[PDB]
Amino acid sequence: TTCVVVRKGDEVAIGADALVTFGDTRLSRANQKVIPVGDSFVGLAGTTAHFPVMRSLLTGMGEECRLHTRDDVFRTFLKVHEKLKNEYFINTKEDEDDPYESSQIVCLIANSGGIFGVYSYREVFSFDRFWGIGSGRNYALGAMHAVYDRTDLDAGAIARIGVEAGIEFDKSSAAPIDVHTVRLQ
Amino acid sequence: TTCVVVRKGDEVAIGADALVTFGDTRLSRANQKVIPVGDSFVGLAGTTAHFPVMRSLLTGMGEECRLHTRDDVFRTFLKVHEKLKNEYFINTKEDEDDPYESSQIVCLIANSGGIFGVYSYREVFSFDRFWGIGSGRNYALGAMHAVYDRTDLDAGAIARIGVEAGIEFDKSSAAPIDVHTVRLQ
Amino acid sequence: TTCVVVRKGDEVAIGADALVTFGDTRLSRANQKVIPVGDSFVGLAGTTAHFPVMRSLLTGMGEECRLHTRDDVFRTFLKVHEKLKNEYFINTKEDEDDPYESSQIVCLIANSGGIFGVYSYREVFSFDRFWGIGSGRNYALGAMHAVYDRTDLDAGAIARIGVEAGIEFDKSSAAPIDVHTVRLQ
Amino acid sequence: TTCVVVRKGDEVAIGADALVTFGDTRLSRANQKVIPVGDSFVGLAGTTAHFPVMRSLLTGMGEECRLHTRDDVFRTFLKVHEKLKNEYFINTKEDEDDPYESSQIVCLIANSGGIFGVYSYREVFSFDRFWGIGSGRNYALGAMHAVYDRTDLDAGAIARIGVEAGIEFDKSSAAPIDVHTVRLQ
Amino acid sequence: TTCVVVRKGDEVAIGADALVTFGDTRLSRANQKVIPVGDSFVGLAGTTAHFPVMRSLLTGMGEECRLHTRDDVFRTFLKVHEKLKNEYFINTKEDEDDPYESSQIVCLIANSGGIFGVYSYREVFSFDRFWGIGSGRNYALGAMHAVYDRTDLDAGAIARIGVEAGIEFDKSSAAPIDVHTVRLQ
Amino acid sequence: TTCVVVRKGDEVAIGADALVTFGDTRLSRERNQKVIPVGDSFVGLAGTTAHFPVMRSLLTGMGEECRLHTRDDVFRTFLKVHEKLKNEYFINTKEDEDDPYESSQIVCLIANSGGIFGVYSYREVFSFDRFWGIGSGRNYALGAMHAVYDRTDLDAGAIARIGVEAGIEFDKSSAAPIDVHTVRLQ
Amino acid sequence: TTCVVVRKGDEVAIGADALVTFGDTRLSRERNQKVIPVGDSFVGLAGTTAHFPVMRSLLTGMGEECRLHTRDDVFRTFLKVHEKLKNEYFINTKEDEDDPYESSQIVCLIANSGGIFGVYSYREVFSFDRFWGIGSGRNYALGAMHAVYDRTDLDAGAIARIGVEAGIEFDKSSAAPIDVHTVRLQ
Amino acid sequence: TTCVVVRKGDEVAIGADALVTFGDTRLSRANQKVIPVGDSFVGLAGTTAHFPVMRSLLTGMGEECRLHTRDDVFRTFLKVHEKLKNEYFINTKEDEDDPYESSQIVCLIANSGGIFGVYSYREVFSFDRFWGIGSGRNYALGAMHAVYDRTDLDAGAIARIGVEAGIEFDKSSAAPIDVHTVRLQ
Amino acid sequence: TTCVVVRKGDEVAIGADALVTFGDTRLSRERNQKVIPVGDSFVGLAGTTAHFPVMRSLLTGMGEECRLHTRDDVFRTFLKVHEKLKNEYFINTKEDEDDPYESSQIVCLIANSGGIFGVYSYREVFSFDRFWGIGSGRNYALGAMHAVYDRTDLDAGAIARIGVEAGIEFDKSSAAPIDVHTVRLQ
Amino acid sequence: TTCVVVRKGDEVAIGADALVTFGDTRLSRERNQKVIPVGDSFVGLAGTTAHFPVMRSLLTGMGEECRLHTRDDVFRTFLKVHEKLKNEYFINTKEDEDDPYESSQIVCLIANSGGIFGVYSYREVFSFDRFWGIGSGRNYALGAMHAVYDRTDLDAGAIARIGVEAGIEFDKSSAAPIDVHTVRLQ
Amino acid sequence: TTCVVVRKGDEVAIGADALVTFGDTRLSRERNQKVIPVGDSFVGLAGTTAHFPVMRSLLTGMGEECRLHTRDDVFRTFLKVHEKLKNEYFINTKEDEDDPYESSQIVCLIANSGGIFGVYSYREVFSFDRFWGIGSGRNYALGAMHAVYDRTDLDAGAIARIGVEAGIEFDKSSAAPIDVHTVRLQ
C-alpha cells in the first residue's frame, strides 16, 4: 500500500494505490482502501482482510463520526475502539512500553479541517504539508518532499506524484491511482 | 483442501475436493467439507478435526442463519462466533494488528444471493467471478482465470475445472469432486 | 499407547496395550487405560499422569453419561469439560484457528450404538470399520486395513491384530493386550 | 532430591535425603523435606524455596487433612490447591493437553492406609510395592527393585537402600538419610 | 532522544533535543517532547507515537497534577496510570521481578520544588545535581559531570552542554536544543 | 518471477514475466533480463536479479562447449558451469544429498529443438513432456496450463503465454510485459 | 513415499508407490521413477525427487563394478558411490558418528537373488530376514506386512503389494499405481 | 549487590554495599538499599528502580509491620503483596511449578527476634548463623563461613567481612559498607 | 548512508551524504570519507565506516590496473579486488548462489565518463540508464529523483543533490553536508 | 574498560582505567595491565583480560619490526601481528566484509609522537584529530572530552584524565586508579 | 570442582576437591584424579572428568620437555601441549580473539617452586601473587581465602585447605576429601 495526504494553500488531498491482496495472492476488483465518511476521506492501513468491518463501522456512524479537528478525530476513534470490542468482538490493545510498530497504524484522514493520522486508535497527529503510510511510503515521502515547493503544483497533483513514486518502486503498490481533493474551511 | 466458488450469468457454483485427514493420516469415508445450510452451500476451511461442531452449529440454526446478502452473512457469523463461545466453549479471537493468516479463513458460501467468503467470523467478502481457499487454491485460481471467458463453460463447469487443478498438483487435495450449482434470484 | 476400535457385522470391539509410564520411567501395575463406563468401554489417550481424574469423573457420572449416539457422546463430553473446570479446576481450551494436535485427542469409545472418537472434548466422530490412536496407531491402522475383509476374522480378532502391530513396532506400546467386544443393538 | 515410599507385609516406609539448596548454593541446616502431618508422613518434591508455605499449610489443616485412602488424599489436595490460591495467592494450574512434567509432582505419602503419590494437586496414585521421586529416583528405583524380594529386608530397610542409591550417584542428593516406618491398619 | 535535568544553586533546568521520528523515518515539525504542565516542565521518554495522549492527559489535569515534591509526583503519576487505563484504554503494567528496562522510563521533571524522574508510573526519584534519559544520555552524563563544578556555569548552561553532547554523538538526537530554567522556592 | 516451458506437437515454447527487483525495491529496465538466448536455446533464470549478470556472462561466453539439446548434454554442460563459477568467479554452489527440496536450488528452465528441460542445483536435470514452471507465480501458471493444454486451437507458444498471464494476475512478484519464444523440434 | 522389500521362501520382492513431487507440488509422469533396475537387482530410492537423476545416472552407469548380491558387496559398492558423488558430481554425503538416527540419511532398499538389503548414509548396510520399508508411509506398510506375512496363500510379491497398498491408503505422500518386482533366490 | 545477615551469641547484624545503578549506568547518591522499619532493618534485593515503592510501603506501615517471628514476617509480607496490587498496581505472582529464581528474592531481615529471608513475598526462612543475597553473595558466604568461629569476631564484624568479600570480587558491589547490629531479646 | 548516481544527457553525477559512525556513535571528521576518487572515476562505498580504510587503500593503490569505464572492465577489476582482499589483507568475501538478496553484499556505486555502475558481492556488476541509489536513505532518494528526473532545468548533478537531500531529510543515518561530483560522458 | 587517546597542540595522551576481570569476577593486581609500552609508543588493549598475555608478549617482543608512527606503518605492523597470531600462537582473527560493526573486533588505541590511532580487526586503521575512546565506558568519556576539549587551561594529558574519570564515574566495568601517559609530537 | 592455588612467604600450595562425574552421574573412585604430579610441579585440571585421561597421559609422558617454573616456560610448554593434542590425539583447541571470556576455555592451575600459575585456552598464561581458584565452587573459595590470607598463624597450605572447604560447603559439584600439596619456593 501507498497512501498519502497533502496540504497546500486552501486545498488538501488524499491519494492511494489500488492493490488489494489476501496475503501473497492478488484479488481483482471492480478503490477499496479509501473510504468516504461524511465529508471526509479515510485511507486504511494494513491487510485487506480487515477492511470490511472498518468500512462498515465508519460509514455506519454518521453524525457521531466527527473528524474536522485533532480532538474530534481523537474522541471519534476512541469510540471506534469501543465499538470494535463491544459490537464486533475485535481487540485493539495498546501498551505504553511498546516501541513503534507499523501494524498499529490505523489510517490517514483528509477533510476541510486539515490532514490527520491515527495510530493505535488513540494517538492522533496533524500534519502541516504531507505524510504517507504503507509499504511504499518512503518512496512517496521523498517524491513529495522534492516537488512540494513547485509553484505549478497544487495539493492534488503532489499527492498523485507521491502515489506514483510508491507504485514505481514498491511491489505491494499498484495502479490505478485514486485522488480526492477538499477545500479548507 | 481445494474449495472454490464461481459466479457466471444467472448461475453460481461451489466446488470442493474430498480428502479428509487427522494430521498426516488419511481418513476413509462413506463429501464432508461441503454443507447444505437451508438453501445455501457452505465449504469449510481448515482441519477435519473442527468440522463436527461447525456442521452441527450451522445446520441447527435454521431460520436465524440468513446468508443471501453480505450484511446477512456478516450478522449471521457474528452469531456463530457467540454460539461457539457460549454453547461450545470454543475461542475465535481477532486482533486488528495481526497480519493475514490462512488459519483465520472460515468458509466460502454459494446461494441465489451470490458467492461469499468469511474471514475470522467477522470480515465478509463478496466475489464477482470466482475465488478459492485451501492448500490447492493457487492452482485452482490459475485454472479458473484461464477458462472463465470460454462461451461453452457455465459456472458449474468452471468450478469443476478449478477443483481438478487443485487435485492435480496438491498432495492435500483428492478426488472425487463435489459440485453444486444454484440459480441467482 | 496403541488403542483401537473396530466394527464388523453385529459386533464392535475395543483394543488397547498395557504400557503405563511417568515420562520415560515405566510403572509396573497389577489394564489402566481402558475403562468400563456403564455398558460402554472408553480408551484413554495421553499421559498416565492424567488418568486418575478422568477415570474418577467418567465412572462417577453414571446415568448422565450417555454414549450410544454421536449427539449423546457430544453432549456428555461437553459436560465432562465443564466438570473438569468447575470441580477439578482443570483447563481444556479449544481455539478454532489451531491445527490438528495429537495432545487434543481424548478417547475412543465402543458400545452397542457403535464406535466413536472424541477430540478436544467437543468434536465427536463416528467410524464405520475401524480407527486407532496413540504412538503405535499408524502400525495398527495398516494391520487392520490389511486384514479387515478376512471372512474368518470378527471385530474382536481384528482389534487384537491392530494392537499386536502397535506392540511389535512401537517402543511406547507393550503387552499384554486387552480386548472387549460388544453386540450392536 | 531422592524421596521413596515402600510397602511390604504389614509395614510401609518413607525415605528421603537431606540436601537443601537455593539454586546451586547449598543451605546448611540443623530433615526439612519430610513432614509429619497428623499420623502420616509427606515427602515434598521440588525446590527448597517452596517448602515453607507447604509445611505451614499441611500441618495447620489438622482434622480436614485426611490421607488414609486414595479418594481422601484426592479430596484433601483439591482443598490444598484452593487454599494456596485464596489464602497464599499461589497458582497451581493444570491443562489436560500438557505432557508429563517433573515440576508438577507434589509429594509422596506414607501412612497406615498405604503409600501414595500426588501429581499436580489433582491426580492421585496408589502404589503396591514402591516408588520414588526427585533427581535421584531412577537410581533408587533400580536399587529397590533389585532387593525388594529379599526375605531379610523389611519396608524400612528397602527404603534406606533406595535413598542410599540416590545419594551414591546423584549430586543433588546428600546424607544423612531420614526413614520413618508405619504399620498398616 | 537526549533529555536532561540539572540543579545548581537556586536554579534548576531541563534540556531536550528536537528529533522526532515514526520508527526510522524522520518527522519534520514546526519542541514536541518537552511539555509545560502548570509551572513545571516535563520531558517525555520513548517513541513519538505515544506523545499525543501523554500531552493531552498531563495538560488537561491542571490542579490535580501536583509535582513539587517526591510524594506529590508519586501520587500524581499513580493517577496518570489510572486515567490511561480507564479513559484511554492503555496498559502500563509493572511486575516486581522484572529487571531494569529503558522502555519503562516515563519522564524527567523540573520545577521550583526540584528535579525528578519517573519510572513505570510508580517509582519516583529525586536528583541532587543532574540526570538524563534517552539514547544519548550516557554522552550527556559524561559532559555534565565533567563541567558541573565550573564556577561560570549555571544550571541552564550545564543542561545545554548535556544536550549538545547527546546531539554530537547520538544519531537519534538532533538540534535545535530546548532549555528552560526555574528558580527554586 | 513466473517462467514456464511448454511442449506440444512439433513446437516448444518458453515464457517469462519482466519484473526485476533488488529485494523489495523495483528496478526499471531494455529487453527481458531473465530470459537469455544461449546459442539456439533459450534459458530462463530462477532466483534474485542480483545473481543474473554472472550467469548471463558465463552462459553466453561458453559458445560451443554449451551443449543443451539432450538431458545428458545439459547435465554435463551445467557440471561445467558449476566448476567455472567456483574457479573463475569464486562462487559456491554446494549440494548435500540429505537436504530436502529447496526453491533456492532451482537454476533454470531450458527450451530448444531437443525438448524442454529444468536444472536443479547445477547437477540434477529433468526433461518434461508437456509443461512446467518455476518462481513465485508458478503454481498459478501450472493450473492455467493444465486447464488449457488439450485445447486444439492452442499451440505451445499460446499455452506459455496463458501460463505467464496467470502468474502476473495473482502474484505480486510477477509483472507484464510477457516474453515468449517458440522453437520447432528437430 | 512407501517402498518395501520382502523375502519369503525362494523369492524376494520390492514394492513402491508412484508419487513424485517437487516439494508440495505434484509432478505428473512414463514408468515408476523411484525404482531402478541396476543389472539384475532392483533399487528403491528414498528422499526427494529432486535428487533422483544423479543417483539413477550413477548406479545404472556403473555396470560391472556395481555388485549387490551380498552385504559386503553392497557395502563396498556404496562406498564407491559415495566417492563418485564427491569426485565426479561434487555432491557431499557426510557421516558423523555422534549423530542420532535421521530419516534423511536413508539411501535405498535393494532386492536381488542374494537377498534384501537397506543402505543408510552410503556406509551402513543391513540385511533383512522377512521384510522392511522406508519413506513417509512405511509405518502403515510394516503393520500390514507383519499382519499378513504368515498367510500360506501369500508369496513375497503379494506381501509387498499389500505393504504398498497400506501406505497409499493412509499416507498423503504416497499414491497409486503400485510397482512390484519379484526375483528368485539363488 | 551484596547484602548479608549474621547471628552470633546475643547479637545479630545486617550488612550491605552501597552501589546503586539504573541498568549499567551508575547513580551517585548522598545507604539506599538498607531500610529501618520500626526496630528492624530490611535489606532490599533486586534493581534500584523498584526501591522507592518498597521503601514507601514498608516505612508507612508502622504498627501492622510485625517482623520478630517467622510467622509474623510471613503474615506481614502477605499484606505487602496485597498492598502492592491494590494500592500501587504492581504484580507479584507465584507459580508452584516454577524453579528457583534470583529475581523472586525480596529481602533479608535483622531484628531482636532473629535473622530472616523472604522469597516471593510468601516463603519465609529463618537462619541460624548467616546468609547473603545479590550478585556478590557467593563470595560473602565463603568469607563468613571461613571466619564465623573466630572467638575475637562478633556478628557485626562477620557481616563487614562478608560485604568486604563481595566488594572485592563483584563488579556490581561497591564501598562504602553499611552495617547495623541489634541485641537479641 | 545515502549515495546516488545519475546519468542524463552528456553528464553523469555521483552524490553522497557525510555521516560516518562506529556503530551508533557518531564520528566527527576533513573531506567526505565515503566517496573516493579512483583515477578519473568516483566510487561511493556502501556499508560500515569500519571497513572503509582497507577499501580506500586498495582502490587508490591499484592505479592503472583499476579500469572502470565499461561493465566488463568494472567486473574484471572487482574480481581482482576480491583476490587482493583475500591474499594481501586476509579478508573474506564469499558468495553463494542460493543466497537471497542482502544489502550487506552491496559494495559500491561508480560514476565516470563511461557511465554509471553498481557492484554487488564483488562479482555482479550492473549498469544504470537514468539513476540508482544505495544505503539506508536510498528509498527516499529514489522517489525524489524519479519525481524530478524529466525536469528540463535539472542536469545530472542537480538531480543527484535532490536525491541526497531526500535521504538526509528522512533518514537518521544520513546527514549533511552533501558531496556531489559530475563527469562528462565520452 | 575505559581507554582514551587525545591530541592537542604539540602533545598527545593516552588514558586508561585499571579494572581487570575474569568474566564477572574481579582480579586484584602491579602496574596497569591494559596499557603497554611498545618501543616509544603506548598501546591500550580492548577486550577481555584473558587475551592480554599473548598480545603483550607479541607486541613487546617485536621491537624494531613494530613501527607505529604513521597510519600506513601501523597498518602494515598489525597485518604482521595477525600473521604471527595465526602461525606462532595458533589464534584466529577472521574478517568478513559483509559483517556489521562489532565492538569485539576492536584491537587497540595507540599514542606516539606520530599521532593517535585506532585499530579495528587487525586490518582497518584510523587516525584521530582530537580524541577517541573505546570500551564499556567510552560513551561517557567521549561526552566529557568533547565538553572540555576547547578549555585553554587543559592540555592533552588533562583532557584524557577527565575522559577516564567520566568512564569510572558511570561504568561498573571501569575502576580507579587512572593511568595517563603523554608524548610530544615530532 | 573447586581447585585453588596459594602463595605466601617461602611456600606455595595447590588444593582440590575429589568429586568426579560423567555428567550428572557420580563416579566412585584411588587417589585424587584431578590433581596431577608432573615432574616436580602439581597441575589441577579444569572441566569435565571425561577429558582427564588424555591430559594426564600427555603431561606425565612429556617429562623433560614439560618445563613449568616460569611464565614463559609454562607458555611455551602448553603451546606444545596444544600441538600434541592436534597431531597425536586428533583433538581440537581453537582460540578466536573476538570471543569473550568463557569458563570452558580454562585448562589448569599450576603450583611449583617457581610460583603459582593459571593457563587459559592453552595459550594465555597468568602468574598470581597471593591466590586464585577455578571451577564451579571457586567464588566461595576466593571469598574464604581473601578473608583469611593475612592471618599470621596460617601458611599457604592451610589457606588452600580453607579455600577448598568453602567450595565443598556451598557447591553441590564439589565434595570431600580435600587434597593439598605444598612446595617451597626456590
Numbering used by the authors:
A (entry chain B), B (entry chain B), C (entry chain B), D (entry chain B), E (entry chain B), H (entry chain B): 1 to 30, 34 to 188
F (entry chain A), G (entry chain A), I (entry chain A), J (entry chain A), K (entry chain A): 1 to 29, 32 to 188
Which sentences from the paper describe this structure?
The second hitherto unknown bacterial proteasome family member was primarily found in Betaproteobacteria, hence its name BPH, short for Betaproteobacterial proteasome homologue. In this study, we present the first experimental characterization of two bacterial BPH proteins. Their crystal structures reveal homo-oligomeric double-barrel complexes with internalized active sites akin to those of proteasome and HslV. Unique structural features, however, like an elongated inner pore loop with a highly acidic sequence, distinguish BPH from its relatives. Confirming an initial hypothesis, our cluster analysis shows that BPH branches off from HslV and appears to be its direct descendant.
In contrast to the Td-BPH crystals, the obtained Cm-BPH crystal form was not compatible with an assembly of 7-fold symmetry. The data could be scaled to 2.1 Å in space group P6, with unit cell dimensions suggesting two monomers in the ASU. Via the 6-fold symmetry, they form a dodecameric double ring with intersubunit interfaces reminiscent of the tetradecameric Td-BPH but resembling the architecture of dodecameric HslV. A closer inspection of the Cm-BPH crystal structure reveals two malonate molecules from the crystallization buffer to be bound per Cm-BPH protomer, specifically intercalated into the intersubunit clefts of the rings from the outside. Like wedges, they bridge a part of the native intersubunit interactions formed in the Td-BPH rings, thereby leading to an increased curvature favoring hexameric rings. These hexamers are presumably stabilized in the crystallization process, allowing for the tight crystal packing depicted in Fig. S5. A potential result of the smaller radius is a different conformation of the pore loop as compared with the Td-BPH structure. The smaller radius allows for a tighter interaction between neighboring pore loops within the rings. In contrast to Td-BPH, the pore loops are fully ordered, although this presumably represents a non-physiological conformation. The apparent ability of Cm-BPH to assemble into closed rings of ancestral symmetry, albeit artificially stabilized by intercalating malonate molecules in a rigid crystal packing, demonstrates how small structural changes (mimicked by the malonate) can affect the oligomerization symmetry within the proteasome family.
